[PDB]
Symmetry: none
Subunit: 258 residues, 4 copies
């Protein structure tokens, strides 16, 4: 079973989505060479807890030890904030999930630290475009495989591959619910969407091969071939006749709704 949110649920999911988005709008100005990922963690934690009157969902979730994930360069996802400083040339994913009165909002973005290689800007830009294209096919009657196909085409046309062993997910009063949202596949397949469903689209897109590999800490996934990997995430509501992005930021120019 996949849950269908009620209009009061939906109203609380917007509040949580907007706060998650705000963490990312806030954090931007602290992102520069020499800031450590655990300093970023601490800043986002304090903001969420003290200013938004909310809770960071990753903290202690299945043992995860921090409030945010910070994934740099060849790391695909789930990087643990630590004492390493950011370096000129790094690309950085900051993945935020906020819980507000029980409702979750989940989003992430890429940051380019200083002078980055040019393959890297474009990897980040195309990955963001993939997410947006997945979002744009969302409507009642669409199938989950439409999201995957349109993401996969756009990645592969640009010489990149789609990560297969991590995916998006339903979200609500629970952080991870059904369905699993694959970022590759075949249009018209998988389950059919319905108004009131909420789920994330969070493609991870690699510069080389798609395979990944888990590090010692059991969290941090990296690209097997050690090339770069980028991710962007939004929380998406299926509306009556399209989509609403619950986690849209004010820097973004993509439409909040269809």
């Amino acid at each position: 079973n996949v849950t269908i949110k009620t209009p009061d649920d939906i109203e609380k999911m917007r509040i949580a989505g907007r706060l998650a988005a705000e963490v990312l709008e806030m954090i931007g100005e602290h992102i520069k060479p020499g800031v450590t990922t655990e300093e970023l963690d601490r800043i986002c934690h304090d903001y969420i807890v003290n200013e938004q009157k909310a809770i960071p969902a990753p903290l202690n979730y299945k043992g995860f030890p921090k409030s945010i994930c910070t994934s740099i360069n060849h790391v695909v996802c789930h990087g643990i904030p630590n004492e390493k400083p950011l370096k000129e040339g790094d690309i950085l994913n900051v993945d935020i999930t906020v819980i507000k009165d029980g409702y979750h909002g989940d989003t992430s973005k890429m940051f380019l630290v200083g002078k980055t290689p040019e393959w890297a800007d474009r990897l980040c830009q195309i990955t963001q475009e993939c997410m947006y294209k997945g979002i744009s096919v969302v409507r009642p009657g669409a199938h989950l495989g439409d999201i995957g196909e349109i993401i996969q085409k756009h990645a592969e046309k640009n010489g990149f591959s789609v990560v297969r062993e991590y995916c998006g997910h339903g979200i609500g009063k629970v952080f991870h619910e059904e369905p699993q949202v694959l970022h590759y596949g075949r249009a018209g397949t998988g389950i059919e969407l319905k108004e009131g469903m909420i789920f994330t689209i969070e493609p991870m897109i690699n510069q080389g091969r798609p395979e990944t590999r888990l590090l010692g800490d059991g969290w941090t996934a990296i690209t097997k071939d050690r090339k770069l990997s980028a991710q962007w995430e939004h929380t998406v509501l299926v509306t009556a006749d399209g989509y609403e992005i619950l986690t849209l930021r004010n820097d973004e120019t993509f439409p909040r709704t269809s």
Copy 2:
């Protein structure tokens, strides 16, 4: 098979669309109780031929006897201008198509004649929204049934029904061409939209039931239940990033392109 207009074709279509739009903006000022529909036909005729240096496409088209269509209240489409005066409380569709140097521009709008009942107003408002929604899903890679579903869902959800046996149409150097644009249907179905296609979105939406009957004159369609019917129409080009409304008027707030 569906033509693909060239850059020069498109510019000529842009000119024809603007001209068709200007007929509607011009005629608005002559619409009031007491004026006859044949008088409005005359005024549109002379504006088209003598001022625009264009041709009224409907005139003698498969025997049609006038230069415009004028549909009042329960008449669904293709009403024939005549000696009957417009009455306080009527709703009037004026449907225009202009040929300029061989290129067609097709558009219609509703006019409220003097003081109108609120159920009439609501009909005209929902039909316009249906049309705008239909236009908003237009981009390369959309399908035709996306237009049909969004229109039908919006109408039916608000208590109205969609006319089934009349539809929009490809348009260019010919008045009526492939494809048929159904105002009902299921998204993802039908042909796939490509840049440079041009067709009309022209939903006819009824107050009660969808059924129509053709009167003796072989032209004038009415609602079978004799309840009200409204229509709005625009000529639409698929662009690289979405849509351009070639028949947009000055009095509209809905945007020209994506």
Copy 3:
């Protein structure tokens, strides 16, 4: 693969279906206690061949020796018209298929012969209802298992069983093509329905248990428990919108389309 009928095909399937419906409307007036099924076969054959200028598809089809099927009481399907007279109390299915210019129309109905017992009437009523419900979910993007599921649940919730080893079928210029249309199963399974597909929905529903067995003659299927079995069949087109019952009789009050 499943054939998609062109619009011309469809117009010809509409003709064939009206003709098949008309046989059923005609033959109703000859059904009463005392008349043999042979005589009804003869009357149906004559009407089809001499008045409709059409052909009865069952005649000689895989050896079948008559023009219509006549299935009485515990007979589930494919009964052979014979010299036995109908008796008061009987329920009778007449299953017609007409070929008009190569195109097929397939439909059946239950007749109550004279005074029938109440449980026989209830069986016939629930079978018709099941057929209508099966038809009601037909539209583009539906799945074949949706038809099955809704028939099965209505039958079973009302105390009856669904016959499993006979099913509906694609039909057009051939009598029996893909897909197989099972009258039991699960929503969302099976092939997706598309505009232009045509197939029968013809559930056989039993008073008691679902199992059948085939008599010596190679054709006549009966209930294993010798209780009553009913069937109703229509030919159904998938339209842009939903469904169109090509075999609708003017005695029916269920809507021709959705």
Copy 4:
């Protein structure tokens, strides 16, 4: 406008009328269950051509492919003789027109094939009575309407209906001339009868509703409700005193003249 026949025309119309009568007197012997309408056709053709030295007027007349019309049961008129055997219980109309030296005689009667139901014998009788009453109001100064009214009043008192789409006709050296003789209407309407006019009275009376439909062959008209229809016809001269029935048979008791 209508022609007046000369005394000499008249004497040649008597000859043709008598010969048409004699075809009907001859053919009764051969009417029994199992004989085909085409054999009756063939027998009539040969008698007319070889024994009467005349011509069967229906042959190749506007494409009609036989020498006589044979209408059975729910066939209203213009049945084409074919391979189908007459069946006991059938009512048959045999309609004859003989051309003798350029002059036409046109008449038909009902036959009962073997044992026949009571309702049917009665339709045939009442229809005969309607014709005779129709004949009985014929004199100079009578109006055509008189003929229609009195046939219609008798039909309707008996629960039967008059066919409106076919009618009697002037007849002479041409098969069909002015006027149209309607078998329904209001007394004192229509043109005024004058001595020397010759026309047919040929009422088709249906057991149920009046409406007809045409079978695919473009000739064979049946009752739309499929109920019985009967017809009888004579060719009638207007005289000094009243009427003369040119096609009276020797088995008939009604007076030849007024």
